[PDB]
Amino acid sequence: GADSVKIGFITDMSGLYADIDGQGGLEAIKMAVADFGGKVNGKPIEVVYADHQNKADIAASKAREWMDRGGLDLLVGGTNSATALSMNQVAAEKKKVYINIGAGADTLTNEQCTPYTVHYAYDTMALAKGTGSAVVKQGGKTWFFLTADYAFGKALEKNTADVVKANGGKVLGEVRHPLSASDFSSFLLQAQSSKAQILGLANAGGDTVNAIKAAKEFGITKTMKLAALLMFINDVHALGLETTQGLVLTDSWYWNRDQASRQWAQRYFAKMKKMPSSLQAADYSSVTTYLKAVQAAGSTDSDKVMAQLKKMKIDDFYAKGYIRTDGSMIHDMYLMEVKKPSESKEPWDYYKVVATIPGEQAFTTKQETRCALWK
């Protein structure tokens, strides 16, 4: 804006994704602003926010209004890939810097890649390549998908099905459920009748939690192993270790990884009284990264900031990495296994690291890209 550098954050603050990002993510953004000193290029930094209520149209209309009449300099995209994609289009049209953290669809750096988009934390290709490969390599050869009926589920099912098939496995079928489904019983029985070895949960947040609860309840887990293709620390906390032990998952960050992660998590906890998820961590990091780019450019001009973003290393408590041509922030990913209750040594101690997946190997390869800007 004229008087301020304006950061806007749009995410689900009220529904099935609120705990994993939501208000906590907003808090993390405000801490990053304060920690940077509250100003950049001699202008105060102002944060605005909105709850998209899991509506792509709300997200896109708010973004447009802030860009056109609110002097927006950075749009931070939160959860829900339908909202991520509607916002992406607005940012590309208006030539405004857009960093998406909470949403997963790899579409953002592929079919719908833009010169103004950064996909910061994770995507559905990394999920598939991590958890999908690992489960198939362990002998989980036959799969049936339970898929959230919107852009995220569809993208994740496609990436994961492709990995399964590439690694000698077979996909027997899929069943769709509405976002934030109130009843999973008929869907789970269809999956059970398929006789697949693996039930791939191509869904997230409250859907993942409710589906796992329902699967354990209806006895689905007697005959099928669940592959939780996207699970955050809050989802484990909701379900408990007794139910989640042994699940393999792919994530970008965990509070207890190392000294630097723990120290930041302590500052977060001191405010929110929960351990942060990888999204809440990434929210803070992405703001630091943006502000460093504005500081180095001496400008909020979107072409100058994008050029800075694409030439600066990132190295903070969240990640070491860089932002490449297609917009992906390349950083190592982690294959983890959920602990047994007896292995958990303090509150929120949920993960065993199985493997580190190198950044260059975790995301879409040059040869397989659908990004028309990456040749």
Side-chain angles (χ1 to χ4, degrees), residues 121-135 152 156 160 163 227-233 235 247-254 278-279 331-338 351-358 361-363:
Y122 74 103
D123 67 32
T124 53
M125 176 68 78
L127 300 175
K129 289 171 79 170
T131 301
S133 305
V135 173
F152 171 71
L156 178 55
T160 307
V163 170
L229 297 168
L230 185 53
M231 169 161 301
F232 294 95
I233 200 181
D235 304 318
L247 289 173
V248 172
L249 58 89
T250 296
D251 207 343
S252 69
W253 187 90
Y254 59 110
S278 62
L279 307 183
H331 56 300
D332 291 352
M333 298 293 286
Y334 304 97
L335 188 64
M336 304 204 295
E337 182 180 28
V338 178
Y351 304 108
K352 290 179 284 195
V353 179
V354 178
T356 297
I357 306 158
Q361 306 170 23
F363 295 95

Side-chain angles (χ1 to χ4, degrees), residues 123-150:
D123 67 32
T124 53
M125 176 68 78
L127 300 175
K129 289 171 79 170
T131 301
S133 305
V135 173
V136 177
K137 263 108 155 155
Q138 285 169 341
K141 300 305 175 173
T142 66
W143 290 59
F144 193 92
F145 292 93
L146 178 60
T147 301
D149 191 16
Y150 74 121

